[PDB]
Symmetry: C4
Amino acid sequence: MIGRLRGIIIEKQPPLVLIEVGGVGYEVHMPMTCFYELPEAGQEAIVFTHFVVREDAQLLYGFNNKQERTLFKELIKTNGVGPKLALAILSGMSAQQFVNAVEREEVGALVKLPGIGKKTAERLIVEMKDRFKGLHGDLFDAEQEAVAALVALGYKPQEASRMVSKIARPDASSETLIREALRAAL
Amino acid sequence: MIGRLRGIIIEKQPPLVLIEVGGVGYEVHMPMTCFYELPEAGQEAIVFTHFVVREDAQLLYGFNNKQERTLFKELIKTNGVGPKLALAILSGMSAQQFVNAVEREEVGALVKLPGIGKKTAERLIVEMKDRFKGLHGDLFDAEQEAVAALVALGYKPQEASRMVSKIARPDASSETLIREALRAAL
Amino acid sequence: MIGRLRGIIIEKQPPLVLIEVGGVGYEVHMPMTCFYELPEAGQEAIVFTHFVVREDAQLLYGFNNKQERTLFKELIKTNGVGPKLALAILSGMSAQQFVNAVEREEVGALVKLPGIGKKTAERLIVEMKDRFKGLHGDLFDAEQEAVAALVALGYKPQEASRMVSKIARPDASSETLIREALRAAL
Amino acid sequence: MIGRLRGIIIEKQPPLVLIEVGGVGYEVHMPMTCFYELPEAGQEAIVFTHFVVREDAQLLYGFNNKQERTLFKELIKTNGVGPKLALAILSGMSAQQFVNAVEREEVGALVKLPGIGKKTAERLIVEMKDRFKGLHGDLFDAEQEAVAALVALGYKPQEASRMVSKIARPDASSETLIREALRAAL
């Protein structure tokens, strides 16, 4: 449920940051390429977070923008790749370099990074390439926002794209598109 | 344990809202019909929430008033219907339209919505109609507040209504009714 | 981990209170006898809490003082008695009345309350009477504080009382007693 | 995820402290040797914490500095030793005394403390002595910070020390060391 923290950077111990919100000091685990961009200790930072809930522990993974978080969330969906590994992948290379290596199927650039291997590198590339097709954008709009909303409700991507086509009126909010699209389907 | 959030709306990405409380950014999942009523980003919002705790994740579902939340809480009690489905039901129609479709047994209005079907639509109507009888009101008072309190303590609805009858004195707080009713039963 | 809430009472719906701390609205479940003593909506309240963590849900039980909470914590240790039942026991009678009924073995006063029975009433009395012997006090001091600390560390009650006797110097902090007692045992 | 609390000390009940952050009262369990150093009730305290998450409960263990917390975290990794026992070990002796007793293999100093025994005392000493070798320091630097970061990413300690040697340039940030070391390995 915790999507964003805004507070004072108390300490940096890569890959860990300690952000103070109120008087609560959150431990945020961040990939090294996001780590370089952090403000200075004593200054306010805004980090986008991904809460991983376990039975044994509760952890916050933090990123500087939503595109990096989505990438990380996409990455941990593939069997064999978890938060620590995803943290290492985005430490060894930026999000843009990772997407570029996925698109050009560079399965030699990723094999060096610890904990994955050769077959999982290959499976990661195949799988991520497939996931990027339907993924957001600007690294990988009202009408697109509206399809996403509909997919979130339970419609299948293609059928949601169908619904947001019939009433798709350029220069119109994503919400009215969702309202209009849902109205003419029930 | 989290029943209400009051903070600044940071971002809207239907059905998700990001509300900032202190410097903590909560991700709230809201049905589309509540979503339309939200203030503008940068303005304060008050949302009634339902915390769902899992072993893998922790989520907040948010509504603009308590009646919608109760409806949602009632809805997720029926096997086959979970938070995502309940979110879709209250996206496709308002709470009032849903109660009206339940009372008039319109099992054609709900069949269109994704993820449920025909038999579950039918079971939903039967089950919700039965639950509404004893449900709060104004969509579906000191004396009624007092019966509820007693049901919460473990008394059965009918016996709790019995207790709040013998001493039921119009123009008197629900608490004194609970105090008086509990006193003359022990 | 949440032991106390101090905030604004937003709504009362016995046995539920909604306390706002920051802009976070906590749902606190309180026994009716504590409920009567709450300030008025819009005014600040201080409630002592007991966090019950489950896999399905996370709940706060609240009391006006530490003695009531201890009683509640003691109560839920007995098989057959859980938070809802303990909530009902402290709703039907005050903490003082409950301790008095336990000491005088009144197993007719408790049998009326819903959800327990006759054998569990009897077992509750036997068990609570045994637990009160070693329990805190004022309803059921530096030297006593110090024994408690030592019991918490893992010493057995009798041996901890032994340790805080040899160096027990009236008119001296519980901490120095713990320091002195631990020093002369290792 | 909670690494630090900064708030007002409300009550002390060794080994428990109640720290108020906002209007939220956190129960922090602290070893007695850290307990002696706490400010006075009504004054601000800064405690370093270790959140233990269970299915039944959620607890905060607190320390005055990071070295004590690391020790505690190291301690609870050994089978037979849990938070309560670790709390007792750091109550009976300071962190420095404990490290000294580990280095000099004093397995008579620890045998007195309740809940452990003789074989676990012996195993604790062997195991802690082995863990201290690679452990931080000042009780047990940019280049060392950088190796730690790399170990956290998944590299093995020796190979991470190899990487931070080839480009190890005295008088240079730990982050650039991590950036430079990661660059010349992929």
